[PDB]
Design a protein around this ligand. Structure first.
Ligand SMILES: O=C(Nc1cc(-c2ccc(-c3ncon3)s2)ccn1)C1CC1
Length: 340
């Protein structure tokens, strides 16, 4: 049937208006609770409702971040409402329903042994670094960059950052947990038990999803944090004593105490391999900033005026830059916004 509730509009002021929707179905689950998909009775727009349980004697870090974020490549928080077993409540996050994720379209290609077109790979990754450079400016680290958290529309080719329950405003001094992120996309510093990491861990996970697109399979598949490090050393090579010191110092076992360059599939664009190399660096500082990655030579086909999607539709919102977005090296604005 239909259901109406009083929700405070996200990002906007505290003016709880009434929202009514129908046709609710579960599109996902998790430890937080469950995410639904409903249809707003007005305009018939399909949304997503994330029912996360929360103790009333606190404040959801996700909700605080989502209300302070507004970017084309980030799923906007439309509204939010509570619908609660004593000192607890269920926080429901109403967001725009993006119809697909990068993992699903990547799996559909992997099920047929076909590489995703580089045009798709270049547009998705660029929209990822654009959302990263946005959230990284405010000092927020997603801490869960994965293809399942990279929503995408098939027609408009618009990608948006999905989850934010693992994100935290990384401040100086404040120690944060190490065992974060998905294993296949976890940075090496987190495996070594570093509590002083920066937002460059999202860049490592960005380099991992890039390789998964140019290879049809996860680049670093392990069953444990230690096993994940063996996959990294097998490809990236043995980290030197400086890089092991650039991250947290710790001793670790291994299957053996043993850097193949030819790892990517044939016909892989060399410009992407150069980008993926600057992203998957042992040293967290050598990793390109999300804005520095946007200005890479691999993202030059999109910066061309005559760029167009396969279905004839023009390039989606590729520019639309803000001063906050360019807080890291504003000089690079001419490469992020060509005269085109
Ligand atoms: O899920 C699907 N669309 C979908 C999802 C979301 C989400 C937002 C937050 C989410 C979450 N947080 C933790 O865990 N999940 S999920 C938003 C919009 N559309 C269908 C198409 C595949």
């Amino acid at each position: 049937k239909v259901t109406t509730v009083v929700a405070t509009p996200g990002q906007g002021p505290d003016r709880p208006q009434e929202v009514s929707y129908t046709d609710t179905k579960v599109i996902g689950n998790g430890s937080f609770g469950v995410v639904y998909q409903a249809k707003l009775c007005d305009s018939g727009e399909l949304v997503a409702i994330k029912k996360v349980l929360q103790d009333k004697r606190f404040k959801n870090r996700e909700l605080q971040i989502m209300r302070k974020l507004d970017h084309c490549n980030i799923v906007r928080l439309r509204y939010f409402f509570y619908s609660s077993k004593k000192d607890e409540v269920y926080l429901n996050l109403v967001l725009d329903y993006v119809p697909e994720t990068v993992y699903r379209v990547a799996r559909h290609y992997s099920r047929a042994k076909q590489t995703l077109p580089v045009i798709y790979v270049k547009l998705y990754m660029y929209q990822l670094f654009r959302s990263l450079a946005y959230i990284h400016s405010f000092g927020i680290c997603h801490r869960d960059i994965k293809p399942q958290n990279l929503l995408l529309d098939p027609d408009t080719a618009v990608l948006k950052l999905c989850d934010f329950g693992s994100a935290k405003q990384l401040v100086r001094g404040e120690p944060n947990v190490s065992y974060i992120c998905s294993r296949y996309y976890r940075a090496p510093e987190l495996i070594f038990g570093a509590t002083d990491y920066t937002s460059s861990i999202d860049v490592w996970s960005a380099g991992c999803v890039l390789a998964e697109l140019l290879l049809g399979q996860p680049i670093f598949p392990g069953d444990s944090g230690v096993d994940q490090l063996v996959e990294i050393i097998k490809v990236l090579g043995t980290p030197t004593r400086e890089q092991i010191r650039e991250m947290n110092p710790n001793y670790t076992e291994f299957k053996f105490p043993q850097p193949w360059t030819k790892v990517f599939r044939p016909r892989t664009p060399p410009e992407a391999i150069a980008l993926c190399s600057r992203l998957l660096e042992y040293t967290p500082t050598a990793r390109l900033t999300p804005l520095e990655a946007c200005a890479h030579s691999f993202f030059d086909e999109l910066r061309d005026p005559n760029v167009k999607l396969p279905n004839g539709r023009d390039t989606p919102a590729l520019f639309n830059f803000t001063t906050q977005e360019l807080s890291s090296n504003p000089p690079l604005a001419t490469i992020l916004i060509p005269p085109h």
